[PDB]
Design a protein around this ligand. Structure first.
Ligand SMILES: *[C@@H]1O[C@H](CO)[C@@H](O[C@@H]2O[C@H](CO)[C@@H](O)[C@H](O)[C@H]2NC(C)=O)[C@H](O)[C@H]1NC(C)=O
Ligand SMILES: *[C@@H]1O[C@H](CO)[C@@H](O[C@@H]2O[C@H](CO)[C@@H](O)[C@H](O)[C@H]2NC(C)=O)[C@H](O)[C@H]1NC(C)=O
Ligand SMILES: *[C@@H]1O[C@H](CO)[C@@H](O[C@@H]2O[C@H](CO)[C@@H](O)[C@H](O)[C@H]2NC(C)=O)[C@H](O)[C@H]1NC(C)=O
Ligand SMILES: *[C@@H]1O[C@H](CO)[C@@H](O[C@@H]2O[C@H](CO)[C@@H](O)[C@H](O)[C@H]2NC(C)=O)[C@H](O)[C@H]1NC(C)=O
Ligand SMILES: *[C@@H]1O[C@H](CO)[C@@H](O[C@@H]2O[C@H](CO)[C@@H](O)[C@H](O)[C@H]2NC(C)=O)[C@H](O)[C@H]1NC(C)=O
Lengths: 345, 345, 345, 345, 345
């Protein structure tokens, strides 16, 4: 017969009256475009910029009755990406792009297949820099949700309708990890249907649930700040008259709590509100601060000064034995109330 | 009848004498273009570069009497973005762009609607990197104002006039936060009307008021530097003859004030003038510096040396009891005068 | 005769029926494209982004029977890169691109040679930003494997087949080093043959084995943290009654362990799970933490207080002589179990 | 009459013999192009890259006698930026570009006006990344000069001559600040006239004088290092036999001088030569270093040991009273010679 | 006569049989292209990426006998950069580009001159991001050599030959400095002549010798670490029984050596092997480590305990007087062997 390249030029030439600027079923029912994505890459989840980049295969399927044929023998055709300007394609865009591009290395990474009844499969490769706003109030113990929504730009709801297909709407590649999160295998799929002053525009979205890993912040930040508060309680087991040994241990403990905290603020994100790790670094600073002021009272009671002089020594030995039990108890009450209120969420 | 794509080619072809290089109402009254924006994204407010990036829908409406029609039945047409070079469009630009681009993924993200009386709606999607100069003199307690002004480049004031529409000139998307600021819901809308040596060019601007959040700088920088100044007053409650305990507490307190200050200068911005956080870190360094020089005098008065030797001990016990009250009082006077002069602004 | 530029226009013009949109041997056996690369540059192996960039010469060879000739005398032709749109070229792409571009400085860096029997050599210069997921669980003692896979985008397995040539499939330039890794001279070459819902697409991949160098982390991080644990054992050789000398040495050792650890977390990568260097910095923090709590017991046993008072001094001298041998022994057991379990992998 | 778009096509069409590849007054006197700029933005003065970026309006005026007219009534025409390829324009470039681009958002930001006698005004909007080499030998007390030179690329001195206009050659926008510098209101305007082996090419340049602000480096770096040297002199007022109090104060002062210096090297630039701030941080390290070696001598003279034993105590009390006056005097001599030699420049 | 633009169209039109796809002297001797560069900018020598960027004028000269003329009177023509596609130009590229671009602001920054005998001068402006592998084994005392090689991509050695001209092959602009290196005025110029499996391709290269400046690393890193080792020797001049004064000075010296070292690893590059600055920071850590273990022995010999008790005091006073001389001697042996072995290279 004739080659498929010359048949598609016959099917969409100046003859037969095809126009790429006109949607199929024009002045009729709306075009139903069904979509699914294949995620190749996922990551660089930035938090100062509040975005993440993803690398997808965007597959679209619609019906175009002007592209139906019966004369060519084979049941499917494929159009070269150079001749792709002569197809009505949907004006899909991502409502939170924040930057995107195509891939055009060795060939345009684009695909088109026109079936015999007029079904059109259109698959392109996109790198997106999609934006998701992030809530770092409980920073190591947080769960993030980053959406991916797909609108139509120029056609309203009565002309073009997007849907997820009912067989695998979001696939993810196999060997795909993240430096700080894990990606759950549960994708919410829902409609949004944007309303502007311009009109009703269709949109569908896919949600991705991210759970931050914990093991670095425990070993590097929670456990070392825990041991410094234990070292601040060694002062209560050292006797009263060892005045360089008590304020030396008292201030070199608040210095190593300051060094532990200031050295780790470079690894933390740069939001301007209080996180959950920031409460821990500040409450553990109070337990080291309050253990020097304990000895400030003990050194002051034991110098006020006969049967009266043994009362002030007995009074200062009392508070040294109260705080020997009370500070591992008050810090335990905080250590229960901290981890319950950040694992109840 | 005939399709709208072939009707718009008839309306703007080589026949009927349409020219896209000529404004409507040429050699007459000026073109009145009315504008409104829809902010999709807002953030990455840089302070070394002194700019911020925004993602908008720019909607423009003007009247073009050459594009009026009556023969086509429907009350509005829409032009494909491929055929968009055959429209007179206003040469709007942003007078503080510092970099900008269009969005052209899966389709040019552009929209055109030509109504029946000649009204033209033109909506495009722009990512701007707009510049706003910032005033970080009172850094945590600052309010920023970042404008967004829209000039005409080639047409002067007698040929083209920009206006904000009187129904929602700036809309903002719903789920839109910032890592360090909050965006107030009050937008000033005013004229600027640039005068050059070239002519009078129209411009309209929109102002955005940003208020910096406070909670991180209190918990990480003000409160920890506060507790170190309290620890520097423990020395006055420790007796006079404990010479390693007084200068050990005196210098390990100025070391933990240096560690607290130097570890937080990496999180602060890099301007070359004094902020309000920089005054706090330097005045709190003086209160720890001055509490060692107090003991430098006490250790010197109590060694000058009979009824004369009990005067110098009584003189050194006097100044240890004066500064035991005076340093929480002088630091309270600064702590009142600091927060009043940075909340009166 | 005639010049080769005018002969290739005769061979592929509107006459003779050549079409660049149609593969050779159409409706027949699949096109066998044989490939090899030449790596010019290799590096910037990022770990927060989890990618690496490479600069290659991509050489492709296939047979095109429509391009066979006998009239021109010379045994090979070469086509100018301006006339390169008139060749069927394979739609190769890299399945993990994450960004790529061509080189077009002073000329398109592209090459085409059409032999007399129809063999076509096509060589282009590409800069890739290929993605490889990295496993930093055992961070200094890790071996990375970063693949480079080459699919076809639009032609399925029955139409186009990629192969590595059996003579030098991957060459690497001579003077080519890395800042943190070494590149082994062993490249695995294997098939992958992607299956989508679209079809069976050919792909071949090349694996590169990266071994991280060790010498910086020993001299800067392991050896200095080793010497601090030795300094923490000096306390057991200092006598019992030197109470400022024991807790001064005990806490300034946990402070210099905190300073050594916090100052090196800026040079470490920013994953959110525990590495092997992170276990070493935390276990060595326990050996300095536990050597103060040893003296907290010794100072407490030697103050409980006659023939009973010499028991508590003898009991506290016992544990000072046990831990004088036990802590270099328990730390040696960890130092054996650490390096065996990270050199068995 | 006829519209100006159709008149400019008549003035520069295939008829009347206009050629955009030929300069006006060809084979005659050279074209005199007069230039002025309007600076919109100015900043991000990098010092590792040694460049700065600027955002300008470049206005050019020349005479073209082929573009003179008398038939059209109005005294000035304006050409659309789409039709701008049909004008001879000067091949101006910036001799230190290091990267530049145009602005093409909503319209090409370009302007052309052809007056009646043939005068042509051409105004474009450019973002430049101009390079200026910087001299950071006296780093806080430095004055930078960053030029902006404008050559011709292809036309030599006998064909094209650039000049600054004698009425406002450089204008600067009003609300325009810098994070670390101030921009003086004095612009030097001079010729450079490049000589190559290709020929004599015209160029004009504009110089911008930048003066670095001081207030951050005083409050954060000079004053805190000043107070640490004062704290190192407290040791001379503490008596001789307080051996933990003298070497504790002596070494925790050299530690807080090391912490102050190492914490501020991250905010300093990364040149590989000695600055003026680097001399201050090193000389102030010597004054804290030399105050421990003073006590190393005092503790050694007072232990050499009768009428001889009171000589060595009197000798060690002598040097403790010499350095009590000498170190505030020798540090004052440096503090005079430092600020004079960096304010004489 | 006729203008030069219309004469060059006559010289290279469809008549006279010029073809830009065919080299001059085709099927004859090879084209001899002679080259020289003019360096405008040079710097941003990255070491994690291992590259440097340069801004050049690339001048090429060859002979094209088809472009010879005699009818036009003037001895040289110049072709507009718009008409530059109609010239055979050499397919030069840089064999280590790693990214490059042209400059096209206000005009393509390109130049062409066709002389009367057929000599063609072609000068373009290029920004290169050339790659040079760097050897940071002896980091402050290193000399770098970064090449710049210029191949041909498509023409082999029998068709096209590159040469440096014998009069100024590399010129450098006058006011051109570097933040960390100096550029020597000695450029090696040599051939490389790449051999591939494709053929023999010509290439010429130019080498640039970079010498790193020293003055920052001495004042900030070598001298401060030198003074800390001197402070660690003050302990030998302090007597034996001052047990808090000896281990306080001993451990606050290893802490200020850790602070000096960890604070400067952020300014050092991020290679994963040992440098020369890394040996200095580790050997100077041993001299401070070994001066506490000296006192660990002195405090242990002087407590073992009559005529026997004066032996152990005399034995411990012996080793305190040995190491008082030996540690300034052993550190002097290292300080000779260090600087000789890094200035012999
Ligand atoms: C696109 O899908 C919609 C939803 O299924 C279709 O709209 C319905 O079509 C049926 C008949 O097929 C009608 O009975 C319903 O009333 C329609 N619902 C509406 C308009 O809301 C529509 O026909 C589909 N269009 C195409 C071209 O497939
Ligand atoms: C654009 O808007 C301006 C301002 O409303 C219009 O100018 C006025 O027009 C009225 C008549 O409609 C005159 O009486 C006024 O004197 C005009 N004011 C001026 C010129 O300053 C103008 O007509 C509008 N143009 C179009 C095309 O709508
Ligand atoms: C491409 O290579 C394949 C694999 O060698 C070829 O397929 C085989 O061809 C032989 C005959 O040459 C048949 O006997 C086999 O049955 C084929 N195997 C298949 C189809 O799996 C194929 O012919 C080659 N095509 C070209 C154009 O060279
Ligand atoms: C461009 O400016 C130059 C400098 O003013 C002009 O050159 C001079 O022209 C006058 C006559 O107008 C002569 O008497 C001088 O000898 C010229 N000086 C030279 C050539 O150095 C030149 O004419 C101007 N050209 C145009 C086209 O305006
Ligand atoms: C390009 O330069 C080469 C080297 O000088 C020339 O090759 C030589 O030409 C001379 C005659 O001029 C012969 O005697 C030599 O045998 C040639 N050497 C070779 C081919 O290796 C060559 O002629 C020059 N070509 C042009 C076009 O100038």
């Amino acid at each position: 017969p004739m080659p498929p390249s010359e048949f598609l030029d016959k099917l969409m030439g100046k003859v037969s009256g095809y126009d790429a600027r006109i949607r199929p079923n024009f002045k009729g029912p709306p075009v139903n475009v069904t979509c699914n994505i294949f995620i190749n890459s996922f990551g660089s989840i930035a938090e100062t910029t509040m975005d993440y980049r993803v690398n997808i295969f965007l597959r679209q399927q619609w019906n175009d009755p002007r592209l139906a044929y019966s004369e060519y023998p084979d049941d499917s055709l494929d159009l070269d990406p150079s001749m792709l300007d002569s197809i009505w394609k949907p004006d899909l865009f991502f409502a939170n792009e924040k930057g995107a591009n195509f891939h055009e290395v060795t060939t345009d990474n684009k695909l088109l297949r026109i079936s015999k009844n007029g079904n059109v499969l259109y698959s392109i490769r996109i790198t997106l820099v999609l934006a998701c706003p992030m809530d770092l109030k409980n920073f190591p113990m947080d769960v993030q949700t980053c959406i991916m929504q797909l609108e139509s730009f120029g056609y309203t709801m009565n002309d073009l309708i997007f849907e997820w297909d009912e067989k695998g709407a979001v696939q993810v590649a196999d060997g795909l990890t993240l430096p700080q999160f894990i990606l759950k295998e549960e994708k919410d799929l829902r409609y949004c249907t944007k309303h502007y002053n311009t009109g009703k525009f269709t949109c569908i979205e896919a949600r991705f649930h991210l759970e931050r890993q914990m093991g670095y912040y425990l070993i590097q930040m929670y456990i070392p700040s825990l041991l410094i508060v234990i070292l601040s309680w060694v002062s209560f087991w050292i006797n009263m008259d060892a005045a360089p040994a008590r304020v030396g241990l008292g201030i070199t403990t608040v210095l190593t709590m300051t060094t532990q905290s200031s050295g780790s603020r470079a690894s933390l994100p740069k939001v301007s509100y209080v996180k959950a790790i920031d409460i821990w670094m500040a409450v553990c600073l109070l337990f080291v601060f309050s253990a020097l002021l304990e000895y400030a009272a003990v050194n002051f009671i034991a110098r006020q000064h006969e049967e009266m002089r043994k009362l002030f020594i007995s009074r200062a030995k009392r508070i040294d034995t109260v705080s020997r039990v009370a500070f591992p108890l008050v810090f335990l009450i905080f250590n229960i109330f901290y981890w319950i209120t950040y694992k109840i969420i």
